[PDB]
Paper text:
Here, we report the discovery and identification of a novel lipase from Lasiodiplodia theobromae fungus (LTL1), which hydrolyses C8–C10 ME efficiently. LTL1 can perform hydrolysis over pH ranges from 3.0 to 9.0 and maintain thermotolerance up to 70 °C. It has high selectivity for monoesters over triesters and displays higher activity over commercially available lipases for C8–C10 ME to achieve 96.17% hydrolysis within 31 h. To obtain a steady source of C8 and C10 fatty acids, hydrolysis of C8-C10 ME can be carried out enzymatically with lipases and esterases. These enzymes catalyse the hydrolysis of ester bonds of tri-, di-, and monoglycerides into fatty acids and alcohol. Structural analysis by protein X-ray crystallography revealed LTL1’s well-conserved lipase core domain, together with a partially resolved N-terminal subdomain and an inserted loop, which may suggest its hydrolytic preference for monoesters.
To gain further insights into its selectivity for monoesters over triesters, we solved the 3D structure of LTL1 by protein X-ray crystallography. The crystal structure of LTL1 consists of two nearly identical polypeptide chains covering amino acid residues 83-449 (chain A) and 84-449 (chain B) of L. theobromae lipase B (UniprotKB: A0A5N5DNA6), respectively. These residues fold into lipase core domains (yellow and cyan) with N-terminal extensions (orange and pink) and inserted loops (magenta and blue) and are in close contact with each other through an extensive interfacial area of 1229 Å2 according to PISA analysis. The N-terminal portion of the expressed LTL1 (residues 19–82) could not be resolved in the structure, likely due to proteolysis during crystallisation. The model predicts that LTL1 has an N-terminal subdomain residing above the active site, which seems to be plausible given its accurate reconstruction of the core domain and correct prediction of the secondary structure (i.e., the two alpha helices, coloured orange in the X-ray structure and dark green in the model) of the N-terminal extension observed in the crystal structure. When compared with CALB, both LTL1 and AFLB have an extra N-terminal subdomain, albeit with a different size and conformation, and an inserted loop flanked by two cysteines that form a disulphide bond. The loop in AFLB flips inwards, covering the active site, whereas the loop in LTL1 bends outwards, leaving LTL1 in an “open state” that has similarly been observed in CALB. With the help of the intact N-terminal subdomain, LTL1’s loop could potentially reorientate and at least partially cover the active site, as predicted by the AlphaFold2 model. The presence of the additional N-terminal subdomain and inserted loop covering the active site seems to suggest that steric effects could be part of the reason for LTL1’s preference for slimmer monoesters over bulkier triesters.
Author numbering: 83 to 449
Write the structure that this text describes.
Amino acid sequence: NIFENIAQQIADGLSTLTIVQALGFSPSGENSETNSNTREPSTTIYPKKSSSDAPYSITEEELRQAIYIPSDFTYGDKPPVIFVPGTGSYGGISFGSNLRKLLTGVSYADPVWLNVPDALLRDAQTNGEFVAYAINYISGISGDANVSVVSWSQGGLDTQWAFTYWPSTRALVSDFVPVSPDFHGTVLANVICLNPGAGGVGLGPCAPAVLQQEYNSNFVTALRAAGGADAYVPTTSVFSGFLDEIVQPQSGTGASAYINDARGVGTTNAEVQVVCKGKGPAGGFYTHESLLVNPLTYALLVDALTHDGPGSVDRLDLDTVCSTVVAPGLGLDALLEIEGVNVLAAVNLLTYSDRRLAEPALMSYAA
Ligand SMILES: *[C@@H]1O[C@H](CO)[C@@H](O[C@@H]2O[C@H](CO)[C@@H](O)[C@H](O)[C@H]2NC(C)=O)[C@H](O)[C@H]1NC(C)=O
Ligand SMILES: [Ca+2]
């Protein structure tokens, strides 16, 4: 029986590989990207909720289908929480072994998650459309409750892009909790794609979302010049300065994950090695992916969800939070699962058929 659950886990993990999907399989289980969601929202959200919003380029059918609503969802009784995966991954598997498992069956959260086609590798401007639609749609079918957003890696960058160009979504998000975000992209993408940045032809073929996540990319530059480098809602950014093998730089105020707060809406910038320094293993070495099981990450998420404003380092009992390797309620097996999540993602990055020399054109709205 325990065998059947491992077989089904592996099958669900492999269905997220685009090479396997090319054989005609679809993402399965919690990574299903063809969900049937038949409730309508209280208000027109398509093609625009606000006449200030950027247009959608993707059909509402596809936008809505990437949202995975568990049967246990309470449509507003609890506060909804939308989970957003990172590059090469799906919302189901990015968080099922970590944060979303911990947020299943509690009173202050009600999880749903995004399964974007092609493992979040496609143009990030369209990944951003998925987050914008999800915020408006989930709220609009949940009694117009506020939602929260938790993201991993490019997910946070996608959320800032939805906030920047879909203003209507700012009004409905109590908390944005990005884990290992790259709000300034990453120079490791410039290196791997042998690419000058600024959308220039580079010698390394790379997925569109990878090219747009270069440190100086047109996507990142446009987003930051439009306001994407400052928080729009209370933002609890959690990142590791030792060592993020995907996102660099990633330490101090210069970290790609650092969100400024010029609008004064409230921000926490938590480098775990800083916050937990001298106080336990949770201040030790954490990867881009292993951060998702760090107790500081979980503690700051719950704090943010149970209090006005962002998660508060100073309100936490750092002596207790920092004292363990993994969040309470996970085992060291979560450390293993999250390593496999990263491997699957890596495979996707290396083997995705849509490799390009140049970064997607900015849509007319971003320019
Ligand atoms: C839902 O979240 C939004 C954004 O965090 C909240 O809207 C902000 O509310 C504060 C004070 O209530 C205002 O000063 C800001 O200008 C608002 N921001 C935006 C962009 O609207 C809103 O209060 C939350 N709603 C609920 C019911 O929690
Ligand atoms: Ca809060």
